């Protein structure tokens, strides 16, 4: 499912349906349009785990766990510069909400069937 998450993140980046941060995620869940969400686990968060699943797991939540924030940060691309090799100075990303309009692709049906269970 790693390639499915990669292609849906590429779809969100190519259609500008990707948003970064936790305050905008809070606004999206309070405004009741949050459909997709990706969480973080095994990170440098001291007591933020109970907080992030308390403010996340309300209703219709897909559980996606990323092992490292810094690996998540280069995956989202907070500082995606110097593409001819290694990025210069990246900082890891927190929990984000994916409000992407690209519901028709080669694996969006597979993603929705996996999240149906």
Partner 1 sequence: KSYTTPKKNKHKRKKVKLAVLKYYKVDENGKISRLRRECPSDECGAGVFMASHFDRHYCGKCCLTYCF
CB 7 within 8 A of CB 94: no
- Judged by DSSP in three states, 38 sits in strand
Stretch that binds partner 1, among 47-55, 64-72, 74-82, 105-113 (CB under 8 A): 47-55
Applying CB under 8 A, among 4, 13, 27, 78 the residue interacting with partner 1 is: 27
Applying CB under 8 A, among 1, 10, 44, 57 the residue interacting with partner 1 is: 57
Stretch that binds partner 1, among 25-33, 65-73, 85-93, 100-108 (CB under 8 A): 25-33
Applying CB under 8 A, among 6, 35, 58, 103 the residue interacting with partner 1 is: 58
**Number of residues assigned to the chain:** 117
Using CB under 8 A as the binding rule, whether residue 22 contacts partner 1 is answered as yes
Residue 57 tokens, joined: 């797991």
CA nearest neighbour of 20 among 103, 102, 93: 93
- Report the C-alpha gap between 59 and 37 in whole angstroms: 11
Torsion angle (degrees, nearest 10) of CA 63, 55, 78, 10 = 40
Q: How far is the CB of 55 from partner 1 (least distance, A)?
A: 6
Tell me which residues touch partner 1 (CB under 8 A): 22-23, 26-32, 50-51, 54-55, 57-58
């Amino acid at each position: 499912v790693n390639t499915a998450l990669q292609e849906v993140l590429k779809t969100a980046l190519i259609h500008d349906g990707l948003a970064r941060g936790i305050r905008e995620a809070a606004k999206a869940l309070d405004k009741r349009q949050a459909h997709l969400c990706v969480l973080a686990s095994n990170c440098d968060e001291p007591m933020y785990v109970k907080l992030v699943e308390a403010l996340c797991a309300e209703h219709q939540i897909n559980l996606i766990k990323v092992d490292d924030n810094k690996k998540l940060g280069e995956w989202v691309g907070l500082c995606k510069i110097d593409r001819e090799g290694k990025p210069r100075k990246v900082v890891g990303c927190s929990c984000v909400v994916v409000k992407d309009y690209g519901k028709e692709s080669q694996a969006k049906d597979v993603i929705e069937e996996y999240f149906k269970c």
